[PDB]
Design an enzyme around this catalytic site. Structure first.
Site, PDB file in Angstrom:
ATOM      1  N   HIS A  13       0.821  -1.216   0.000  1.00 16.02           N
ATOM      2  CA  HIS A  13       0.000   0.000   0.000  1.00 16.02           C
ATOM      3  C   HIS A  13       0.860   1.273   0.000  1.00 16.02           C
ATOM      4  CE1 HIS A  13       0.289   0.140   4.515  1.00 16.02           C
ATOM      5  NE2 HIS A  13       0.353   1.433   4.234  1.00 16.02           N
TER       6      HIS A  13
ATOM      7  N   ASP B  57      -0.088  -7.590   1.690  1.00 15.20           N
ATOM      8  CA  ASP B  57       0.455  -6.229   1.735  1.00 15.20           C
ATOM      9  C   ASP B  57       1.996  -6.252   1.754  1.00 15.20           C
ATOM     10  OD1 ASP B  57       0.476  -3.518   1.733  1.00 15.20           O
ATOM     11  OD2 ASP B  57      -0.256  -3.244   3.783  1.00 15.20           O
TER      12      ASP B  57
ATOM     13  N   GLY C 240       2.946   6.199   8.570  1.00 14.52           N
ATOM     14  CA  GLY C 240       4.345   6.529   8.299  1.00 14.52           C
ATOM     15  C   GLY C 240       5.316   5.446   8.746  1.00 14.52           C
TER      16      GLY C 240
ATOM     17  N   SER D 299       4.261   2.185   8.242  1.00 16.50           N
ATOM     18  CA  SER D 299       3.904   1.177   7.224  1.00 16.50           C
ATOM     19  C   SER D 299       5.079   0.762   6.364  1.00 16.50           C
ATOM     20  CB  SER D 299       2.857   1.745   6.278  1.00 16.50           C
ATOM     21  OG  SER D 299       1.635   1.920   6.956  1.00 16.50           O
ATOM     22  N   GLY D 300       5.189  -0.534   6.112  1.00 17.83           N
ATOM     23  CA  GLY D 300       6.227  -1.063   5.265  1.00 17.83           C
ATOM     24  C   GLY D 300       7.500  -1.370   6.014  1.00 17.83           C
TER      25      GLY D 300
END
Ligand SMILES: [Ca+2]
Length: 240
Positions: free
Chosen positions: A45, A93, A186, A188-189
């Site tokens: 995402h 994801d 922020g 995320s990932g």
């Protein structure tokens, strides 16, 4: 990261900042994990938007020269083929970014160790989330890399009705949920680093939190379970 502490400079050297071009400058949007000198693992995402991305390795303070950073363009984005933007709760994801150049490894830049395929952590396993994401629900990004201690909440607990119910899948890892410490926008990932046989390994890719807020009691932060994707990761790198 809500309820975090500033990380020591040399602590998490596989952590990267994923940034997009904004006017004449660059804005941090997501974390990621350096897994090869020219590959970063992040969340799908994070790279839905058709933006210009760069990766920063060896970063610590987003807003000042640390003397340790290397800046590299993103040459190719490979999102999991099953990822559906309208359905983060379906999972998948995860994305791999091939860097335009191979970065140089040093004390501040190292490959993240990945778990063996299929590995599931016992409930309440010791993990750390790291990232520059919001330090409060609807707050602002951290200037310096934050870490929070976030023990896992196993699938059986995490998918029960008072936690996430059916929103969480077995392809995910939940951690935290104490109402105090969490991932936030922020992060995320980025990685969830868990201690296994004396070695920290990246067991999660930060995916989502509750719509009610970041630190929400019985809404642990949800990560793509990296061990569910080892073959896919290996196949992508082997074919690109
Ligand atoms: Ca810096």
């Amino acid at each position: 990261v809500v309820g975090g502490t500033e990380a020591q400079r040399n602590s998490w050297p596989s952590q990267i900042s994923l940034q997009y071009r904004s006017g004449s400058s660059w804005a941090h949007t997501c974390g990621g994990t350096l897994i090869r000198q020219n590959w970063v693992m992040t969340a799908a995402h994070c790279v839905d938007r058709e933006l210009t991305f760069r990766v920063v390795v060896g970063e610590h303070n987003l807003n000042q020269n640390n003397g340790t950073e290397q800046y590299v363009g993103v040459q190719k984005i490979v999102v999991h083929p099953y990822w559906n933007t309208d359905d983060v709760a379906a999972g998948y994801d995860i994305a791999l970014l091939r860097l335009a150049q191979s970065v140089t490894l040093n004390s501040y830049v190292q490959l993240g160790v990945l778990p063996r395929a299929g590995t599931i952590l016992a409930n309440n396993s010791p993990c750390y989330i790291t990232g520059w994401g919001l330090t409060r629900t609807n707050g602002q990004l951290a200037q310096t890399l934050q870490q929070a201690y976030l023990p896992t909440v196993d699938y059986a607990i995490c998918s029960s009705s008072s936690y996430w119910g059916s929103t969480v899948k077995n392809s995910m890892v939940c951690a935290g949920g104490d109402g105090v410490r969490s991932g936030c926008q922020g992060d995320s990932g980025g990685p969830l680093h868990c201690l296994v046989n004396g070695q920290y390994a990246v067991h999660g890719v930060t995916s989502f939190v509750s719509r009610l807020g970041c630190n929400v009691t019985r809404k642990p932060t949800v990560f793509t379970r990296v061990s569910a994707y080892i073959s896919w990761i290996n196949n992508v790198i082997a074919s690109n």
